[PDB]
Amino acid sequence: MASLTEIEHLVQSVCKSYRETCQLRLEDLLRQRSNIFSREEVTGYQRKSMWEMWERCAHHLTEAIQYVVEFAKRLSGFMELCQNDQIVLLKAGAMEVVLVRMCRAYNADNRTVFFEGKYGGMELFRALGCSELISSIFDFSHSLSALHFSEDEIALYTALVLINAHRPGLQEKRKVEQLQYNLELAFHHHLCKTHRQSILAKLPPKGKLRSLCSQHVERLQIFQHLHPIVVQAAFPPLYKELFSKILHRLLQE
Ligand SMILES: CC(C)(O)CN1C(=O)[C@H](F)C[C@H]1C(=O)N1CC[C@@]2(S(=O)(=O)c3ccc(F)cc3)c3ccc(C(F)(C(F)(F)F)C(F)(F)F)cc3CC[C@@H]12
């Protein structure tokens, strides 16, 4: 199945689907690099309440996930799978896709991320009280920066990150396995054509993405235990759905 032109068609279809669904153009993020939060501004974020910062972040993470749900809906063959499989893949892989995606909004020269209109270092998120999770995130973005990814590579890689046939709870495991193989051929083929297979060995292990997601849910349980009515009243429904319905309505569209 899938000949060389069908694989080359898949590549362009995945790359188009990601351009249509990335929250901000790479050019937009790159042009902002010199707009860094002032010392005073960082202190403002630091002085903010924990539950306020946590609301802000859950909100931003939900917007990011919403674009990943649209990227999945535009992925070739994803809408063909059953809703159970669609929701299983999105539940496990949505945070994961964002964790890879975020490298575009990171600056390895000054070690800063683009948050709320400006760039800022780790200390911006001090009030969250995650520390190990924030460092883990910042190291993960630093590690993907060393790869000097192209948009096409980030699109092909994230499609694979999402289309994982090993996710527990999949009903048609073979149907995921068929598409995951096709997407893998497209990724490797593109790498091969562009003389970029070198990156394959440097890519993060699957267990790195799993640890970051675990750290996320673990730190969320802790916060929720201290502030249950903040998570109840001020957290977005889709956030509580994936990390604590909406996905079915989001898929219908
Ligand atoms: C500018 C733009 C589009 O928002 C940048 N982005 C992209 O390009 C990505 F695809 C998605 C988006 C993006 O970077 N992101 C979407 C929200 C944001 S962020 O920008 O708010 C942020 C960046 C770095 C960082 F250390 C902390 C927060 C976010 C929010 C919360 C968490 C947490 F895991 C936390 F770290 F706080 F513990 C959670 F959920 F538990 F709260 C993690 C992340 C990492 C991805 C980040």
Curated annotation (Swiss-Prot):
<comment type="similarity">
    <text>Belongs to the nuclear hormone receptor family. NR1 subfamily.</text>
</comment>
<comment type="function">
    <text>Nuclear receptor that binds DNA as a monomer to ROR response elements (RORE) containing a single core motif half-site 5'-AGGTCA-3' preceded by a short A-T-rich sequence. Key regulator of cellular differentiation, immunity, peripheral circadian rhythm as well as lipid, steroid, xenobiotics and glucose metabolism. Considered to have intrinsic transcriptional activity, have some natural ligands like oxysterols that act as agonists (25-hydroxycholesterol) or inverse agonists (7-oxygenated sterols), enhancing or repressing the transcriptional activity, respectively.</text>
</comment>
<comment type="subunit">
    <text>Interacts (via AF-2 motif) with the coactivator NCOA2 (via LXXLL motif). Interacts with the corepressor NCOR1. Interacts with CRY1. Interacts (via AF-2 motif) with the coactivators NCOA1 and PPARGC1A (via LXXLL motif). Interacts (via AF-2 motif) with PROX1. Interacts with FOXP3. Interacts with NR0B2.</text>
</comment>
<protein>
    <recommendedName>
        <fullName>Nuclear receptor ROR-gamma</fullName>
    </recommendedName>
</protein>
<feature type="domain" description="NR LBD">
    <location>
        <begin position="6"/>
        <end position="244"/>
    </location>
</feature>
<feature type="short sequence motif" description="AF-2">
    <location>
        <begin position="238"/>
        <end position="243"/>
    </location>
</feature>
